[PDB]
């Protein structure tokens, strides 16, 4: 089942060589590659490089999924008021797309992640549903 811990597991399974390849490659932005910044920070975390990872995640403190990854995976304590956890479905969907492109996981796991994303945004009638449906159809 597509998830945050299953994503880190694939980064473990990729190997130290493929990790450093993804480290050096994801540091530079690419057009039409959402979740590149978040995947970069997770690469540094599976490579034991906590100090660089925390600097990367601080530059992303506006994204709630980037805040949750900084606290529960990079050990950064919250300075703000205690907030309820965020929906990770859409970020996990983008993270799974890049992992499938890099041939680290099957394309079908990106399809399950994009389907579950559509399901979660539908259960609360999100105004960004059509946006995600366009992305799901384009990536999958």
Curated annotation (Swiss-Prot):
Tissues showing expression: Ubiquitously expressed but with higher levels in liver.
Q: What does the record say about PTM?
A: Phosphorylated by TBK1. The phosphorylated pLxIS motif constitutes an IRF3-binding motif, leading to recruitment of the transcription factor IRF3 to induce type-I interferons and other cytokines.
Mutating residue 67 to Q: effect? No effect on IFNB induction
Motif span (TRAF6-binding)? 80-87
Q: List the disulfide bonds.
A: none
TRIF-NTD: annotated segments: 1-140
What mutagenesis or variant effect is reported for residue 84 to A? Answer: Reduces binding to TRAF6 and activation of NFKB signaling pathway
Localization annotation: Cytoplasmic vesicle, Autophagosome; Cytoplasm, Cytosol; Mitochondrion
**Function of the molecule:** Involved in innate immunity against invading pathogens. Adapter used by TLR3, TLR4 (through TICAM2) and TLR5 to mediate NF-kappa-B and interferon-regulatory factor (IRF) activation, and to induce apoptosis. Ligand binding to these receptors results in TRIF recruitment through its TIR domain. Distinct protein-interaction motifs allow recruitment of the effector proteins TBK1, TRAF6 and RIPK1, which in turn, lead to the activation of transcription factors IRF3 and IRF7, NF-kappa-B and FADD respectively.
Q: What is known of its domains?
A: The pLxIS motif constitutes an IRF3-binding motif: following phosphorylation by TBK1, the phosphorylated pLxIS motif of TICAM1 recruits IRF3. IRF3 is then phosphorylated and activated by TBK1 to induce type-I interferons and other cytokines. The N-terminal region is essential for activation of the IFNB promoter activity.
* Associated disorder: Encephalopathy, acute, infection-induced, 6, herpes-specific: A rare complication of human herpesvirus 1 (HHV-1) infection, occurring in only a small minority of HHV-1 infected individuals. It is characterized by hemorrhagic necrosis of parts of the temporal and frontal lobes. Onset is over several days and involves fever, headache, seizures, stupor, and often coma, frequently with a fatal outcome.
Give the record's subunit note: Homodimer. Found in a multi-helicase-TICAM1 complex at least composed of DHX36, DDX1, DDX21 and TICAM1; this complex exists in resting cells with or without poly(I:C) RNA ligand stimulation. Interacts (via TIR domain) with DDX21 (via C-terminus). Interacts (via TIR domain) with DHX36 (via C-terminus). Interacts with AZI2 and IRF7. Interacts with TICAM2 in TLR4 recruitment. Interaction with PIAS4 inhibits the TICAM1-induced NF-kappa-B, IRF and IFNB1 activation. Interacts with IKBKB and IKBKE. Interaction with SARM1 blocks TICAM1-dependent transcription factor activation. Interacts with TRAF3.
- Annotated protein name in UniProt: TIR domain-containing adapter molecule 1
Source species, please? Homo sapiens (Human)
Taxonomy of origin reads: Eukaryota, Metazoa, Chordata, Craniata, Vertebrata
Q: Which gene encodes it?
A: TICAM1
């Amino acid at each position: 089942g597509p998830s945050l811990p299953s994503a880190f597991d694939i980064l473990g399974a990729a190997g130290q060589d493929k990790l450093l390849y993804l480290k050096h490659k994801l540091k530079t932005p690419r057009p039409g590659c959402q979740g590149q910044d978040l995947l970069h920070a997770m690469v540094l975390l599976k490579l034991g490089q906590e100090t660089e990872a925390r600097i990367s995640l601080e530059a992303l403190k506006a994204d709630a999924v980037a805040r949750l990854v900084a606290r529960q995976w990079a050990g950064v304590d919250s300075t703000e008021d205690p907030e309820e956890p965020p929906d990770v479905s859409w970020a996990v969907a983008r993270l799974y797309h890049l992992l499938a492109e890099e041939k680290l996981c099957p394309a079908s796991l990106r399809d399950v992640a994009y389907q579950e994303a559509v399901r979660t945004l539908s259960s609360r009638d999100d105004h960004r549903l059509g946006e995600l449906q366009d992305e799901a159809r384009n990536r999958c």
